[PDB]
Motif scaffolding. Structure first.
Motif, PDB file in Angstrom:
ATOM      1  N   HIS A 120      18.791 -20.136   6.010  1.00  0.00           N
ATOM      2  CA  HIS A 120      18.442 -19.174   6.859  1.00  0.00           C
ATOM      3  C   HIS A 120      19.595 -19.081   7.711  1.00  0.00           C
ATOM      4  O   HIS A 120      20.790 -19.327   8.090  1.00  0.00           O
ATOM      5  N   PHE A 121      20.275 -17.553   7.681  1.00  0.00           N
ATOM      6  CA  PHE A 121      21.150 -17.274   8.527  1.00  0.00           C
ATOM      7  C   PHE A 121      20.680 -17.488  10.156  1.00  0.00           C
ATOM      8  O   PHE A 121      20.226 -16.687  10.542  1.00  0.00           O
ATOM      9  N   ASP A 122      21.548 -18.291  10.673  1.00  0.00           N
ATOM     10  CA  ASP A 122      20.778 -18.647  12.413  1.00  0.00           C
ATOM     11  C   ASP A 122      21.594 -17.905  13.211  1.00  0.00           C
ATOM     12  O   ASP A 122      20.932 -17.011  14.101  1.00  0.00           O
ATOM     13  N   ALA A 123      22.901 -17.483  13.139  1.00  0.00           N
ATOM     14  CA  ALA A 123      23.659 -16.164  14.189  1.00  0.00           C
ATOM     15  C   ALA A 123      24.840 -16.460  13.527  1.00  0.00           C
ATOM     16  O   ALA A 123      25.538 -16.630  12.882  1.00  0.00           O
ATOM     17  N   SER A 124      25.996 -15.188  14.447  1.00  0.00           N
ATOM     18  CA  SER A 124      27.283 -14.847  13.959  1.00  0.00           C
ATOM     19  C   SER A 124      27.424 -14.886  15.608  1.00  0.00           C
ATOM     20  O   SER A 124      27.675 -14.781  16.792  1.00  0.00           O
ATOM     21  N   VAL A 125      28.766 -15.718  15.859  1.00  0.00           N
ATOM     22  CA  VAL A 125      30.086 -16.385  17.029  1.00  0.00           C
ATOM     23  C   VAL A 125      31.506 -14.910  16.529  1.00  0.00           C
ATOM     24  O   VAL A 125      31.973 -15.439  15.632  1.00  0.00           O
ATOM     25  N   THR A 159      21.326  -9.772   8.744  1.00  0.00           N
ATOM     26  CA  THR A 159      23.352  -9.854   9.130  1.00  0.00           C
ATOM     27  C   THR A 159      23.494  -9.516   7.045  1.00  0.00           C
ATOM     28  O   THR A 159      22.679 -10.915   6.511  1.00  0.00           O
ATOM     29  N   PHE A 160      24.225  -9.097   6.788  1.00  0.00           N
ATOM     30  CA  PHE A 160      24.660  -9.203   5.711  1.00  0.00           C
ATOM     31  C   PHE A 160      25.822 -10.080   5.548  1.00  0.00           C
ATOM     32  O   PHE A 160      27.036  -9.742   5.724  1.00  0.00           O
ATOM     33  N   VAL A 161      26.514 -11.000   4.657  1.00  0.00           N
ATOM     34  CA  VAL A 161      28.075 -12.044   4.322  1.00  0.00           C
ATOM     35  C   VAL A 161      28.731 -11.516   3.012  1.00  0.00           C
ATOM     36  O   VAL A 161      27.830 -11.125   2.769  1.00  0.00           O
ATOM     37  N   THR A 166      27.893  -7.926   7.944  1.00  0.00           N
ATOM     38  CA  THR A 166      27.478  -6.495   9.286  1.00  0.00           C
ATOM     39  C   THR A 166      26.237  -6.946   9.142  1.00  0.00           C
ATOM     40  O   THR A 166      25.294  -7.492   8.992  1.00  0.00           O
ATOM     41  N   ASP A 167      25.661  -6.773  10.662  1.00  0.00           N
ATOM     42  CA  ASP A 167      24.616  -7.066  11.004  1.00  0.00           C
ATOM     43  C   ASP A 167      24.375  -5.320  10.839  1.00  0.00           C
ATOM     44  O   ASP A 167      24.238  -4.432  11.608  1.00  0.00           O
ATOM     45  N   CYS A 168      22.894  -5.649  10.656  1.00  0.00           N
ATOM     46  CA  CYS A 168      22.118  -4.122  10.676  1.00  0.00           C
ATOM     47  C   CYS A 168      20.741  -4.560  11.957  1.00  0.00           C
ATOM     48  O   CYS A 168      19.516  -5.650  11.806  1.00  0.00           O
TER      49      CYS A 168
END
Length: 120
Positions: free
Chosen positions: A115-120, A41-43, A78-80
């Motif tokens: 660390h990127f853990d999640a997107s909610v 995931t890119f922010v 953006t989810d890859c």
């Protein structure tokens, strides 16, 4: 040597999304070298905004650790996700745009995302 914080920036930050985005980004950020990283995931928010999440909503990490934080407001991301037709070294990804709250694990001094853990 690359720090954990620097690794987070390289793997998840892109403050500067076409259907080609993930294929280009995943490669340019060296995420398809040892293997095709399954998902990433890119922010698109500013570094300052993402770093500020470390002082926001404290929530449990997926691995059970307690140093994760959720953003108070949604963020452009953006989810890859790797396709089926994808085969190393030719990694193919599905680029999906969205606006969701992000959850990142923070550590160190200064206390920054590692660390990127999640997107909610």
């Amino acid at each position: 040597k690359e720090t954990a914080a620097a690794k987070f920036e390289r793997q998840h930050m892109d403050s500067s999304s076409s259907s080609n985005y993930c294929n280009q980004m995943m490669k340019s950020r060296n995420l398809t070298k040892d293997r095709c990283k399954p998902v990433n995931t890119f922010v698109h928010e500013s570094l300052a905004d993402v770093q500020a999440v470390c002082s926001q909503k404290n929530v449990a990490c997926k691995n059970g650790q307690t140093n994760c934080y959720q953003s108070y407001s949604t963020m452009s991301i953006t989810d890859c996700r790797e396709t089926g037709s994808s085969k190393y070294p030719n990694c193919a990804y599905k680029t999906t745009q969205a606006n969701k709250h992000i959850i990142v694990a923070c550590e160190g001094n200064p206390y920054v995302p590692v660390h990127f853990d999640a997107s909610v």
